[PDB]
């Protein structure tokens, strides 16, 4: 009852064995210590470019679905983002049921006498409200 | 919960152009 180690069956430990077989790390443990307290880049280093196709697809789908406003010859949709409008001083914006981001461009002016600073963000904040109103 | 007020003062564009 004190030296029966020679009669003890062999421990298998299938999980730990399969983990240590090829994964030379500590995956079978809590790995949220250095992750939850650090802003590491998980994925989409340069592969995010491939998501632009799906982004443009979703943008076109939402455009087709939602009743578009008057043309104004300024409507456009391409990669990267969706050019909202460019007629006159209209700015462009797009996202990144579904969210809707903004602040990609700004207003334009002429006949200088420099132009107004970035205090326009106020309206942008209201735009944010219009982004969350979803009417 | 960002803000529960009405703000217009924060801009406060100064002059600093006293002649």
């Amino acid at each position: 009852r004190d030296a029966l180690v020679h009669a003890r069956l062999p421990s298998f430990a299938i999980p730990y064995a399969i983990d240590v077989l090829t994964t030379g790390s500590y995956p079978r443990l809590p790995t949220c210590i250095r992750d939850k307290i650090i802003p590491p880049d998980p994925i989409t280093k340069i592969e995010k470019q491939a998501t632009l196709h799906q982004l443009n697809q979703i943008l076109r789908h939402r455009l087709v679905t939602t009743d578009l406003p008057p043309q104004l010859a300024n409507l456009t949709v391409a990669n990267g983002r969706v050019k909202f409008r460019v007629e006159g001083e209209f700015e462009a914006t797009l996202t990144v049921e579904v969210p809707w981001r903004l602040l990609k461009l700004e207003i334009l002016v002429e006949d200088k006498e420099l132009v107004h600073s970035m205090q326009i963000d106020f309206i942008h904040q209201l735009v944010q409200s219009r982004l969350f109103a979803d009417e | 919960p960002k803000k529960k007020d009405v703000e217009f003062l924060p801009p406060q564009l100064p002059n600093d152009k006293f002649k």
Partner: protein, 114 residues
């Protein structure tokens, strides 16, 4: 599972428990009845393990060479099925990309014509 290791560990644990009970009783009634029941259960488990290792459980002969060949054939069949599924998935992805392109074209045409 159903491997020899399970029955081997069971028999080893039963033998260890029987040895511990014998050591406890040798240096010492519900206790006598409990010890007799434990010994009978251990003997029955050992007899069943011996019968399984004789008839059911595979002995040292009949190695896993045929089992390894069957596993390799199954892995090759699964790889072929995965390759066919990947080809079908590429076909479907191309079809979906073309459909999305056509839908976007139709939408842009309807927008510009309105």
């Amino acid at each position: 599972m159903a491997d020899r290791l399970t029955q081997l560990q069971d028999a080893v644990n039963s033998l260890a428990d029987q040895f511990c009970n014998a050591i406890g009783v040798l240096q010492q009634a519900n206790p006598t009845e409990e010890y007799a029941q434990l010994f009978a259960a251990l003997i029955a488990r050992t007899a069943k393990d011996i019968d399984v290792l004789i008839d059911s459980l595979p002995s040292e002969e009949s190695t896993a060479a045929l089992q390894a060949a069957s596993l390799y054939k199954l892995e090759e069949e699964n790889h072929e099925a995965a390759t066919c599924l990947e080809d079908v998935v590429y076909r479907g992805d191309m079809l979906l990309e073309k459909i999305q392109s056509a839908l976007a074209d139709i939408a842009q045409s309807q927008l510009k014509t309105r």
